[model samples]
Target: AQPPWPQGGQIEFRDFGLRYRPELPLAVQGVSFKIHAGEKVGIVGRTGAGKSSLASGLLRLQEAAEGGIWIDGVPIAHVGLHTLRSRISIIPQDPILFPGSLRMNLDLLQEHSDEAIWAALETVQLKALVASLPGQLQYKCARGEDLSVGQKQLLCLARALLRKTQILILDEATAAVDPGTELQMQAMLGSWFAQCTVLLIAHDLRSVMDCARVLVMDKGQVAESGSPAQLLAQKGLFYRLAQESGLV
Candidate 1:
């Protein structure tokens, strides 16, 4: 059954663990951490360090093999799948858009008016561009291939803003942004998302520097977690990574 939708954005993992396939061993093992409401947290781990597993675990894309996950003091595992998933939003590196007009893509439910869609675009700093399109909300984006990668990202961002959920997961969401403007867009949007609980599954260490807290995983376990400053002082994996990236 669905519990009351979480008012608080805090998330906690209580000895949580998971495996991709039953016999492949745990992808995340007995990992636990707490993120207070409105805290922006980053996660840094190499390809197999269980970073993505936390994302999957939280979304229940893969059910935990052990322990529990709670959001806003509510144990997420006990809630309905739809209920748990609805509370959070995930923005991936490559944003997905369909072959349809902008209005169809942005307001699939017909829940919001053209004004709302335009406002959403304005938030992403892309309204003027779309406003110039021949049909405005009805602007066609057949396969969305005509748009630049950055445009697609912002398009997805506008959609996310429309949802207005407090929990957002950034799974290397900026990977598609052009290098020349990556820092600019990151800082800009990061500032806006500061109001929500952003679990950043790190793809670039330098990009993650702004996150208030960082979680480092290794061998399917949470090996370290702290503010970037604190993690850098440990001389452990995260520290070593910073050095490799020339941040230290």
Candidate 2:
């Protein structure tokens, strides 16, 4: 079957606003930005700074209360939730896994061949471990509860590699891994998703230093945005945050 969009992964947020519930204030308010196809953008902010709320808005997990999100010139609000999500792959803080066999977890749609599955596993460096399991691909996973966080992350990365979506969202996706593994995975991601648009949300400045543009959020608004060097030179909120993280 065809992917959601015919081509490209240009995303635009037009006056986007989101609120968790009617009683609460908007978590994301009046946020507007444009991310061209194939660009890697990073979002950084302090806790409760509404970074995750922007993510929620993008995924339509919480519909926009004021404005809208667009991808490839189409308003996401106009499309079915599944249609929108199908074209985008997100590896959040807690990667999604359920009670299922290894193959089932990796191939959510059950559309890939075992060879393809193994190839993805190999790329993520989980091939040896899976190969040793009694049932190999058929080994049952306890909602991935039995696996270490790093291992689970690798498994999710394998799934994302297999999907090959045009848009990839990483919400602190590598936070649980060690520095060495994180660097390797970052390198792998750089190569694997070269043509895909990437949105990385991180509290650690180190993880987003390579991004072409970094957006700093504060109190549900865009506090600042620019290249790391540019933001550092400005000596603004981002600079302070970067210094606090010892990036400066």
Candidate 3:
């Protein structure tokens, strides 16, 4: 039987240090934070500020050097990576579509019905496009080579919707999409995944501003965290970012 874990989406990052290589410096260090169930939080930082490391650490892409993460009170280190990953969804910076038909890519486990699959595609506004393909859902994807970058990302989003896991991580998932599409995605996120815990690591200030709270990371550490307004008034790192992006 599968582990009856992840009773809720609550996540606690124990004081951990993450390193890419044994000799290299920690990518993220002494990070400890709790994300309550159903909360949506944003993380922002400059290039190499270790924002992506949060995703890396949570997914166990790189094991923590000294500490580990806990999901709903279950230590991830004690669980199988497959088991841990199956319950948490991550939409990475670049879409990764396995070599197979579009249908396979959308429903890899073949758990959902055709109607449900179509609904997911429709939710991402890719229904009409999919219908235009020669074999429709059966259209073989050459690793999604035919689709544009934005379209590939949308396909990934549809896959995530089909899974509908408790925790969702978006790592620059919209960087390739047009501004209009991004707005549509944000609306969809609000309506569809409202009850799920969301961790958004974004360069788009507007998108980051939409979160209930934001964490600003610098050099592998959380430099500041607060509501957008609070951070703005304090005129610190996040404020500077907003100013630089003209979000202020």
Query: Estimated TM-score per prediction?
Result: 0.91, 0.92, 0.93
In order, the Cα lDDT scores of the candidates are: 0.82, 0.83, 0.83
Question: Lowest-scoring 10 consecutive residues by lDDT in candidate 2?
Answer: 143-152
- For candidate 3, which ten residues in a row score worst on lDDT? 143-152
**Per-residue lDDT value at 137 in model 3:** 96
Q: How close to the true structure is residue 168 of candidate 2, measured as C-alpha lDDT?
A: 86
TM-score of 2: 0.92
Off by over 4 Å in 3: 1-4, 173-175
TM-score of 1: 0.91
Where does candidate 2 clash, by residue pair? none
- Please give the lDDT score at residue 112 for candidate 1: 91
- The runs of at least 3 residues in candidate 2 whose Cα sits more than 4 Å from the true structure, single-residue gaps closed, are 1-6, 143-145, 173-176
